[PDB]
Ligand binder design. Structure first.
Ligand SMILES: *SC[C@H](NC(=O)CC[C@H](N)C(=O)O)C(=O)NCC(=O)O
Ligand SMILES: *SC[C@H](NC(=O)CC[C@H](N)C(=O)O)C(=O)NCC(=O)O
Lengths: 201, 201
């Protein structure tokens, strides 16, 4: 399969996941300003929504939306346990966390990246985002990973989303349980490996 | 089980779904301004995130996040086909749509409901939201429901989210394929039934 991505963006999540699954995949950069693939092709014809990540399956089908992507993957290599079996309870709490990250944290960043966002509304947005991380912090002071004890697709997404913190001037240094957790993920082989391949580290 | 909700909010989605599943459930209103249940209990102790919907399962476990909720439900009564089996492809496109609705449409409304949102940033936000509906419109001019031919948990969520349009002054009247689709859902028994129980219709 082929994962379309942009270095440092949210596609980093499924990237980290692709490695942990130890699968066969090809990646291809996307230029978000021109909406063109590094090979010079029209990206809107691949994904009308014009964002990354996007995943091309071996049968030509396209899967958009990070949370959908990381789940399709993790659900192919159960043995690695990046998820929980479907219909199971643990899984439902995982989907719940993925939705929270996608809608409350991920989308909470959006305005800090827009040029048309009133510089005055910026401190307000930041505070909203911080509170979200303060909560995640709490969750961590009791368990290893956000969705339990073992590393899951939801930890990849949270890691990716916290990488943007610096670039937007969001100090999460105080969140000790989060930091130690972040530090513990930056060490994982395939995380460090996927990070290098992207031009960071 | 007990579904915590607020009339007209996003909890309307899992409400509509609870009926379609023809299950045994009890509902309880939540006062969002005081963060108290209609019985006068502290809602933050039920859901630290302080929002609806929230679902209490028969074993006392709490499931937050709409998309997680509507999936746990639909996955209990397969025969009705409100989803697709797990691991299946159709399902993955469903989770993808649920994420889109949750993060791009649902969260796209958020600012139009905040008081601290600069009245000037408002037309900008509206336009962002409209474009999302314009896309959904396109998708509809080819298929019956958003995720295929049959009615799914994702249609309940989209219906609920379009109900807010008027209250924020968002004209989606031009979107003919969407409207006819909306009109066709407002007719469904359990939709109309769940809508009445909530004080609308
Ligand atoms: S993180 C980079 C941007 N992607 C998304 O916002 C994905 C949103 C989906 N709802 C999801 O995958 O969860 C992106 O590519 N933005 C495009 C741009 O032009 O900035
Ligand atoms: S729609 C009403 C509000 N709920 C949510 O925003 C749910 C967000 C979750 N990410 C989800 O379920 O998808 C709500 O209850 N807001 C609380 C308030 O005080 O307004």
């Amino acid at each position: 399969m082929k994962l379309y991505y942009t270095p440092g963006s949210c596609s980093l999540s499924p990237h980290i996941v692709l490695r942990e699954t130890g699968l066969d995949f090809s990646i291809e950069r996307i230029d978000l300003r021109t909406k063109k693939t590094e090979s010079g092709k029209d990206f809107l014809a691949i994904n009308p929504k014009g964002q990354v990540p996007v995943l091309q399956l071996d049968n030509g089908d396209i899967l958009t939306e990070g949370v959908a992507i990381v789940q399709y993957l993790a659900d192919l290599k159960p043995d690695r346990n990046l998820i929980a079996p479907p219909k199971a309870l643990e899984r439902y709490h995982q989907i719940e966390w993925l939705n929270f990250l996608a809608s409350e944290v991920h989308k909470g960043y959006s305005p800090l990246f827009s040029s048309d966002t009133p510089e005055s509304y910026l401190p307000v947005v930041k505070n909203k985002l911080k509170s979200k991380f303060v909560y995640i912090n709490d969750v961590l002071s009791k368990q290893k990973c956000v969705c339990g004890d073992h590393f899951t697709v939801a930890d990849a997404y949270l890691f990716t989303l916290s990488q943007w913190a610096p670039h937007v001037a969001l100090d999460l240094t105080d969140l000790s349980h989060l930091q130690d957790y972040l530090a513990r993920i930056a060490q994982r082989p395939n995380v460090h490996s996927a990070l290098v391949t992207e031009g960071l580290i």
